[PDB]
Amino acid sequence: MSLICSISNEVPEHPCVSPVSNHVYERRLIEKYIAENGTDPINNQPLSEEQLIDIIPAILKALQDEWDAVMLHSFTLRQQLQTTRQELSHALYQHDAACRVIARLTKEVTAAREALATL
């Protein structure tokens, strides 16, 4: 049957399955990944290559457009990563501000309670 490699998220040419994750990898990618990482991409458990059980110009214009198509996704994935980081930095900023406003108001509530206790 058809498969998807879990690094590419695209159909493998020559697939191999990590038993450390039960899922399909494209051998040249994962061995090169293992060369730097030494670990299973899905979950960062340790992994080694032997464990991986194995399973004109119009064409180049088409190839170029599909090459560009990856690069469309490349900027998008970079920009969404920046945006989620920019959201996270802002969301913590407003949360920390929310703590400081509520601390300011907790100080207000403390002073007012003491002032009412004075009565």
Partner: protein
């Protein structure tokens, strides 16, 4: 419910309007890993 998520994005994005003129710089960690992979292909 969907508008609440947008409201979070809207609030964040306003602050960056002042920043917005600057590039979209690469994540250092993946760039260094890739460069390591790239050099390993060079050797």
């Amino acid at each position: 419910v969907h508008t609440l998520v947008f409201r979070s994005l809207k609030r964040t994005h306003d602050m960056f309007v002042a920043d917005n003129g600057k590039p979209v710089p690469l994540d250092e960690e993946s760039h260094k890993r890739k460069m390591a992979i790239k050099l390993r292909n060079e050797y």
